[PDB]
Amino acid sequence: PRPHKKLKQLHWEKLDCTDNSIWGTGKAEKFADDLYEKGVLADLEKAFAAREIKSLASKEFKITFLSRDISQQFGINLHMYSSLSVADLVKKILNCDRDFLQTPSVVEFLSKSEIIEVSVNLARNYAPYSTDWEGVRNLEDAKPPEKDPNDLQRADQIYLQLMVNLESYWGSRMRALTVVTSYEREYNELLAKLRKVDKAVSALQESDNLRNVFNVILAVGNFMNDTSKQAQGFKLSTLQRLTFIKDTTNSMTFLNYVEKIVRLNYPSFNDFLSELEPVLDVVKVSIEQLVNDCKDFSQSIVNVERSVEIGNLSDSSKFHPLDKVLIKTLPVLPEARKKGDLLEDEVKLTIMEFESLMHTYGEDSGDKFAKISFFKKFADFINEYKKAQAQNLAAEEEERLYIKHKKIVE
Amino acid sequence: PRPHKKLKQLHWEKLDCTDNSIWGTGKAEKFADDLYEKGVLADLEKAFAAREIKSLASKEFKITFLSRDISQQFGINLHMYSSLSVADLVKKILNCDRDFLQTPSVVEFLSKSEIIEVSVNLARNYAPYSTDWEGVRNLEDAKPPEKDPNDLQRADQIYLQLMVNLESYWGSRMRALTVVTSYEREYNELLAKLRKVDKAVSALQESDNLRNVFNVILAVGNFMNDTSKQAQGFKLSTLQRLTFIKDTTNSMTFLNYVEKIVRLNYPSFNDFLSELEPVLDVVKVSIEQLVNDCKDFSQSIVNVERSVEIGNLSDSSKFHPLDKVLIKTLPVLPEARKKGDLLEDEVKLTIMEFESLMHTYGEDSGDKFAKISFFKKFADFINEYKKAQAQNLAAEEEERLYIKHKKIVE
């Protein structure tokens, strides 16, 4: 069954070929005809029909449906292109021009959720100005204007031409492009932020000075404890609590002693304060986070790949005739995935080392708590010492300028 | 080497028996003696010694080191026990008394991070009033008061007696207890919130009415489209866009037609609005979240188990003589893990069904986007109809009270 004249064409996404669904039955016909015979259908032959002449006649208006909020961001985030025309601008993006890709401010923007997310409402309004492109290989071929976007502001015109007509894959277009111009950095940033953990590990690992100080502390300890607490060693918890027991004058704490009881007798040890340098350089790094930042770095690539292979980028016809996303991603992905793995190891490696070091000091390793605070406990203690020592360097040159002065007076 | 008198005992966590660490060497001795011969050690024999008489003499003061903020929460969150004495209160918790466990307000509180987390500082201050318990089986045996907590406020006294002396395992004591009195609920809440997804699934699954309406829509569609868009079916995206094409009077949209073109000819279909009831009852449920809420429900148990087996609850001596955490958990855990699995399946099952239904309607299933919005798209459309129909029920009784009235006037 067919009408007789030009009717309003319906813009929809069909299932290319009848799949394993609710389709196939054929009731699509047992109905089509059934509605034509009963005439009802015929009604629709009317009530729905094409339009004609109306030309331009620049209303003198200009509209916008966007939050005044949004409308603002497009003029801001996209100012360096104020000089270009909407038409000549979408061209700048669709083609993925050098200056565009090298500008994060933009990519980040063209990708913000709140900018792509399109309300049922918002869509409805534009519909009359939209376009399909799905099944369109050239710009001159897409004819259906439906109305005219020039009757919209630069803002809306953009928003439409992009997050609207290409809603079919925008998010996923950008979600890739973001990576296509990033992994490199993301990698480096990540990797370096990773080197800085091994270093901090190595130090603790190979630096007997510390180990020594520890025994000295152990030694003293055993002594200072009654006939029973004959300890073979202590857990790290203890380092913080060395500044807990003060003398009798409440002037210097047990730690102060140690530091001196060390610099006075085996001053060859205090080289450790300069050896655990990195352990302080990276006590800031959330181990956990760093792990995940990577888990996600890799994951992020897996995704763009999937979308390229069987997702929203898997089908080319759907793209805007002038879109060049694939031609800018297909080549990169391997370079990326490559880094993806490279990094993946650096982790699984670094981590084990860390986990090992933990065991060495008796600290747990399966427990989350510990994993975080570990590095800290050392860094802390190191600062606890440093400070505690600068205090021992005063008392020396104090009962020095009083006993080198209680004599030149008697 | 040993001193000669009573020295200040050092509170530390030793490594029970020399392990695979930096301990064993024996330098703990090559130092101990070495410092005694050089006399230096001897010095420490002094500068550090016991105390004597000072008795009570209730200063008339009373101190607090806690943020005024914190101090507030203890009086609040713990008001129902205002009537009890600090001593008789810690007893109420350590023993895990019925009325205590059945009171979330409390458990939640005694477990807040910001309440357990103890600053280097905060610890130092209390140290003089603390206690060890590690290696203590009776309350009368723990003698070392070190000072006197009665010189502290109810607040601090609590905080000390608990998050302080039992810092060695508190968090992990509570982290369990929280579960010991929860999984039950957590389960039920979770499960029910899960039943509500299957129901919403089943409906979409077995309800031909919808399927029909869909074809009707397909039928009309094919017709309304030129000699080429011979579609076998459409993707869900389309449901929202049916309210996109309006007639010529811009009064009723393509959807309005459909609804009527349906209630007029096969009004046996509109039973679907009452059939996809649950699809609306649960369009609120974040599928993703719900999945994880469970992933975490199970995980939460794995944890308490680990901690019971080889963690901070693995060793009993470390607990306060009157603590009864294990005696209240060991028995429950299986009941829990049991639920853990039970639930675990309900999920892996429910999910597959959902994933299946998605495929049926041609919607993706690996993609995250879809998983979320799916249910919605249907629920939406259902509301799009409902509304759109109530509008068709006006135009009927409108061109009815005008043509049943344009006659009784001529």
mmCIF file with all atom_site columns, C-alpha atoms in Angstrom, chain B residues 220-323:
data_model
loop_
_atom_site.group_PDB
_atom_site.id
_atom_site.type_symbol
_atom_site.label_atom_id
_atom_site.label_alt_id
_atom_site.label_comp_id
_atom_site.label_asym_id
_atom_site.label_entity_id
_atom_site.label_seq_id
_atom_site.pdbx_PDB_ins_code
_atom_site.Cartn_x
_atom_site.Cartn_y
_atom_site.Cartn_z
_atom_site.occupancy
_atom_site.B_iso_or_equiv
_atom_site.pdbx_formal_charge
_atom_site.auth_seq_id
_atom_site.auth_comp_id
_atom_site.auth_asym_id
_atom_site.auth_atom_id
_atom_site.pdbx_PDB_model_num
ATOM 1   C CA . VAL B 1 220 ? 2.130   3.254   9.443  1.00 0.00 ? 220 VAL B CA 1
ATOM 2   C CA . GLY B 1 221 ? 5.794   4.202   9.321  1.00 0.00 ? 221 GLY B CA 1
ATOM 3   C CA . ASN B 1 222 ? 6.658   2.220   6.198  1.00 0.00 ? 222 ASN B CA 1
ATOM 4   C CA . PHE B 1 223 ? 3.658   3.827   4.514  1.00 0.00 ? 223 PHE B CA 1
ATOM 5   C CA . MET B 1 224 ? 4.470   7.400   5.585  1.00 0.00 ? 224 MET B CA 1
ATOM 6   C CA . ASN B 1 225 ? 7.931   6.946   4.145  1.00 0.00 ? 225 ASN B CA 1
ATOM 7   C CA . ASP B 1 226 ? 8.926   7.154   0.473  1.00 0.00 ? 226 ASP B CA 1
ATOM 8   C CA . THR B 1 227 ? 9.500   4.233   -1.895 1.00 0.00 ? 227 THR B CA 1
ATOM 9   C CA . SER B 1 228 ? 12.725  3.053   -0.270 1.00 0.00 ? 228 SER B CA 1
ATOM 10  C CA . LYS B 1 229 ? 12.498  3.140   3.535  1.00 0.00 ? 229 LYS B CA 1
ATOM 11  C CA . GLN B 1 230 ? 10.904  -0.314  3.561  1.00 0.00 ? 230 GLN B CA 1
ATOM 12  C CA . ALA B 1 231 ? 11.809  -1.030  7.185  1.00 0.00 ? 231 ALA B CA 1
ATOM 13  C CA . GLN B 1 232 ? 11.674  -4.450  8.816  1.00 0.00 ? 232 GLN B CA 1
ATOM 14  C CA . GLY B 1 233 ? 11.657  -2.821  12.249 1.00 0.00 ? 233 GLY B CA 1
ATOM 15  C CA . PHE B 1 234 ? 12.902  0.203   14.222 1.00 0.00 ? 234 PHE B CA 1
ATOM 16  C CA . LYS B 1 235 ? 15.286  0.791   17.169 1.00 0.00 ? 235 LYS B CA 1
ATOM 17  C CA . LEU B 1 236 ? 13.936  2.142   20.451 1.00 0.00 ? 236 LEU B CA 1
ATOM 18  C CA . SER B 1 237 ? 15.445  5.552   19.828 1.00 0.00 ? 237 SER B CA 1
ATOM 19  C CA . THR B 1 238 ? 12.341  6.047   17.688 1.00 0.00 ? 238 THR B CA 1
ATOM 20  C CA . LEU B 1 239 ? 9.740   6.023   20.440 1.00 0.00 ? 239 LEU B CA 1
ATOM 21  C CA . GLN B 1 240 ? 10.816  9.420   21.745 1.00 0.00 ? 240 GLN B CA 1
ATOM 22  C CA . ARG B 1 241 ? 10.807  10.859  18.203 1.00 0.00 ? 241 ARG B CA 1
ATOM 23  C CA . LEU B 1 242 ? 7.157   9.996   17.501 1.00 0.00 ? 242 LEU B CA 1
ATOM 24  C CA . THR B 1 243 ? 6.122   13.175  19.195 1.00 0.00 ? 243 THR B CA 1
ATOM 25  C CA . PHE B 1 244 ? 8.401   14.989  16.800 1.00 0.00 ? 244 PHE B CA 1
ATOM 26  C CA . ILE B 1 245 ? 6.349   15.177  13.633 1.00 0.00 ? 245 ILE B CA 1
ATOM 27  C CA . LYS B 1 246 ? 3.183   17.223  14.108 1.00 0.00 ? 246 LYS B CA 1
ATOM 28  C CA . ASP B 1 247 ? 0.310   17.520  11.623 1.00 0.00 ? 247 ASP B CA 1
ATOM 29  C CA . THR B 1 248 ? -0.428  20.755  9.741  1.00 0.00 ? 248 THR B CA 1
ATOM 30  C CA . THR B 1 249 ? -2.511  22.472  12.412 1.00 0.00 ? 249 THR B CA 1
ATOM 31  C CA . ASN B 1 250 ? 0.270   21.821  14.916 1.00 0.00 ? 250 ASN B CA 1
ATOM 32  C CA . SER B 1 251 ? -2.432  20.645  17.338 1.00 0.00 ? 251 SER B CA 1
ATOM 33  C CA . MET B 1 252 ? -1.763  16.919  17.683 1.00 0.00 ? 252 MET B CA 1
ATOM 34  C CA . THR B 1 253 ? 1.521   15.149  16.990 1.00 0.00 ? 253 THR B CA 1
ATOM 35  C CA . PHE B 1 254 ? 2.086   11.904  15.113 1.00 0.00 ? 254 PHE B CA 1
ATOM 36  C CA . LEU B 1 255 ? 1.864   10.048  18.451 1.00 0.00 ? 255 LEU B CA 1
ATOM 37  C CA . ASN B 1 256 ? -1.664  11.299  19.207 1.00 0.00 ? 256 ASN B CA 1
ATOM 38  C CA . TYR B 1 257 ? -2.759  9.745   15.933 1.00 0.00 ? 257 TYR B CA 1
ATOM 39  C CA . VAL B 1 258 ? -1.242  6.367   16.675 1.00 0.00 ? 258 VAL B CA 1
ATOM 40  C CA . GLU B 1 259 ? -2.853  6.159   20.147 1.00 0.00 ? 259 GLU B CA 1
ATOM 41  C CA . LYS B 1 260 ? -6.233  6.855   18.628 1.00 0.00 ? 260 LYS B CA 1
ATOM 42  C CA . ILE B 1 261 ? -5.536  4.893   15.405 1.00 0.00 ? 261 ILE B CA 1
ATOM 43  C CA . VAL B 1 262 ? -5.168  2.154   17.996 1.00 0.00 ? 262 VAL B CA 1
ATOM 44  C CA . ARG B 1 263 ? -7.922  2.643   20.577 1.00 0.00 ? 263 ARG B CA 1
ATOM 45  C CA . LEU B 1 264 ? -10.347 3.102   17.715 1.00 0.00 ? 264 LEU B CA 1
ATOM 46  C CA . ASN B 1 265 ? -9.447  -0.040  15.811 1.00 0.00 ? 265 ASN B CA 1
ATOM 47  C CA . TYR B 1 266 ? -7.766  -2.541  18.152 1.00 0.00 ? 266 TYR B CA 1
ATOM 48  C CA . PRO B 1 267 ? -8.576  -1.087  21.608 1.00 0.00 ? 267 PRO B CA 1
ATOM 49  C CA . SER B 1 268 ? -7.557  -4.510  22.925 1.00 0.00 ? 268 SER B CA 1
ATOM 50  C CA . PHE B 1 269 ? -3.967  -3.227  22.815 1.00 0.00 ? 269 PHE B CA 1
ATOM 51  C CA . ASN B 1 270 ? -4.189  -0.355  25.282 1.00 0.00 ? 270 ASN B CA 1
ATOM 52  C CA . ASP B 1 271 ? -4.147  -3.001  27.979 1.00 0.00 ? 271 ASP B CA 1
ATOM 53  C CA . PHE B 1 272 ? -0.381  -2.529  27.697 1.00 0.00 ? 272 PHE B CA 1
ATOM 54  C CA . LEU B 1 273 ? -0.395  0.707   29.598 1.00 0.00 ? 273 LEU B CA 1
ATOM 55  C CA . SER B 1 274 ? -1.500  -1.443  32.572 1.00 0.00 ? 274 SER B CA 1
ATOM 56  C CA . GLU B 1 275 ? 0.896   -4.276  31.678 1.00 0.00 ? 275 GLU B CA 1
ATOM 57  C CA . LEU B 1 276 ? 4.196   -2.395  31.715 1.00 0.00 ? 276 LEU B CA 1
ATOM 58  C CA . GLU B 1 277 ? 3.245   -1.133  35.182 1.00 0.00 ? 277 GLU B CA 1
ATOM 59  C CA . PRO B 1 278 ? 6.519   -2.227  36.844 1.00 0.00 ? 278 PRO B CA 1
ATOM 60  C CA . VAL B 1 279 ? 8.634   -0.844  33.963 1.00 0.00 ? 279 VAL B CA 1
ATOM 61  C CA . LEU B 1 280 ? 7.544   2.443   35.481 1.00 0.00 ? 280 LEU B CA 1
ATOM 62  C CA . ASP B 1 281 ? 7.718   1.225   39.040 1.00 0.00 ? 281 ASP B CA 1
ATOM 63  C CA . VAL B 1 282 ? 11.489  0.789   38.623 1.00 0.00 ? 282 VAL B CA 1
ATOM 64  C CA . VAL B 1 283 ? 12.740  3.211   35.996 1.00 0.00 ? 283 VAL B CA 1
ATOM 65  C CA . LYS B 1 284 ? 14.377  4.853   39.022 1.00 0.00 ? 284 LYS B CA 1
ATOM 66  C CA . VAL B 1 285 ? 16.715  1.950   39.811 1.00 0.00 ? 285 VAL B CA 1
ATOM 67  C CA . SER B 1 286 ? 20.258  2.486   38.655 1.00 0.00 ? 286 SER B CA 1
ATOM 68  C CA . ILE B 1 287 ? 20.985  -0.914  37.219 1.00 0.00 ? 287 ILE B CA 1
ATOM 69  C CA . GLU B 1 288 ? 24.759  -0.334  37.469 1.00 0.00 ? 288 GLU B CA 1
ATOM 70  C CA . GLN B 1 289 ? 24.640  0.830   41.051 1.00 0.00 ? 289 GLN B CA 1
ATOM 71  C CA . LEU B 1 290 ? 22.374  -2.071  42.042 1.00 0.00 ? 290 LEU B CA 1
ATOM 72  C CA . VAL B 1 291 ? 24.913  -4.438  40.559 1.00 0.00 ? 291 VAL B CA 1
ATOM 73  C CA . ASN B 1 292 ? 27.733  -2.886  42.575 1.00 0.00 ? 292 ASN B CA 1
ATOM 74  C CA . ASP B 1 293 ? 25.771  -2.383  45.743 1.00 0.00 ? 293 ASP B CA 1
ATOM 75  C CA . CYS B 1 294 ? 25.764  -6.195  45.664 1.00 0.00 ? 294 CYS B CA 1
ATOM 76  C CA . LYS B 1 295 ? 29.337  -6.648  44.429 1.00 0.00 ? 295 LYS B CA 1
ATOM 77  C CA . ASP B 1 296 ? 30.144  -4.674  47.577 1.00 0.00 ? 296 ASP B CA 1
ATOM 78  C CA . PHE B 1 297 ? 27.651  -6.500  49.790 1.00 0.00 ? 297 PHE B CA 1
ATOM 79  C CA . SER B 1 298 ? 29.525  -9.739  49.065 1.00 0.00 ? 298 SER B CA 1
ATOM 80  C CA . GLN B 1 299 ? 32.926  -8.094  49.193 1.00 0.00 ? 299 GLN B CA 1
ATOM 81  C CA . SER B 1 300 ? 32.130  -6.601  52.598 1.00 0.00 ? 300 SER B CA 1
ATOM 82  C CA . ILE B 1 301 ? 31.782  -10.112 53.983 1.00 0.00 ? 301 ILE B CA 1
ATOM 83  C CA . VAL B 1 302 ? 34.893  -11.452 52.338 1.00 0.00 ? 302 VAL B CA 1
ATOM 84  C CA . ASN B 1 303 ? 36.640  -8.785  54.300 1.00 0.00 ? 303 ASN B CA 1
ATOM 85  C CA . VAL B 1 304 ? 35.362  -9.368  57.805 1.00 0.00 ? 304 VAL B CA 1
ATOM 86  C CA . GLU B 1 305 ? 36.161  -13.017 57.144 1.00 0.00 ? 305 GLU B CA 1
ATOM 87  C CA . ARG B 1 306 ? 39.803  -12.272 56.180 1.00 0.00 ? 306 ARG B CA 1
ATOM 88  C CA . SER B 1 307 ? 40.210  -10.040 59.221 1.00 0.00 ? 307 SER B CA 1
ATOM 89  C CA . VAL B 1 308 ? 38.779  -12.787 61.401 1.00 0.00 ? 308 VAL B CA 1
ATOM 90  C CA . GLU B 1 309 ? 41.096  -15.422 59.939 1.00 0.00 ? 309 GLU B CA 1
ATOM 91  C CA . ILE B 1 310 ? 44.461  -13.637 59.522 1.00 0.00 ? 310 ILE B CA 1
ATOM 92  C CA . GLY B 1 311 ? 43.859  -9.976  60.207 1.00 0.00 ? 311 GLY B CA 1
ATOM 93  C CA . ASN B 1 312 ? 43.466  -7.766  63.247 1.00 0.00 ? 312 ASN B CA 1
ATOM 94  C CA . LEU B 1 313 ? 40.896  -10.007 64.827 1.00 0.00 ? 313 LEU B CA 1
ATOM 95  C CA . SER B 1 314 ? 42.932  -13.116 64.140 1.00 0.00 ? 314 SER B CA 1
ATOM 96  C CA . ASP B 1 315 ? 44.786  -12.673 67.442 1.00 0.00 ? 315 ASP B CA 1
ATOM 97  C CA . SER B 1 316 ? 42.659  -12.693 70.595 1.00 0.00 ? 316 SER B CA 1
ATOM 98  C CA . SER B 1 317 ? 45.104  -11.557 73.291 1.00 0.00 ? 317 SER B CA 1
ATOM 99  C CA . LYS B 1 318 ? 45.199  -8.092  71.690 1.00 0.00 ? 318 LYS B CA 1
ATOM 100 C CA . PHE B 1 319 ? 41.572  -7.419  72.627 1.00 0.00 ? 319 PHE B CA 1
ATOM 101 C CA . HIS B 1 320 ? 40.349  -5.741  75.776 1.00 0.00 ? 320 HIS B CA 1
ATOM 102 C CA . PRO B 1 321 ? 39.687  -8.477  78.387 1.00 0.00 ? 321 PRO B CA 1
ATOM 103 C CA . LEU B 1 322 ? 35.964  -7.693  78.311 1.00 0.00 ? 322 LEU B CA 1
ATOM 104 C CA . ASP B 1 323 ? 35.614  -7.541  74.523 1.00 0.00 ? 323 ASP B CA 1
#
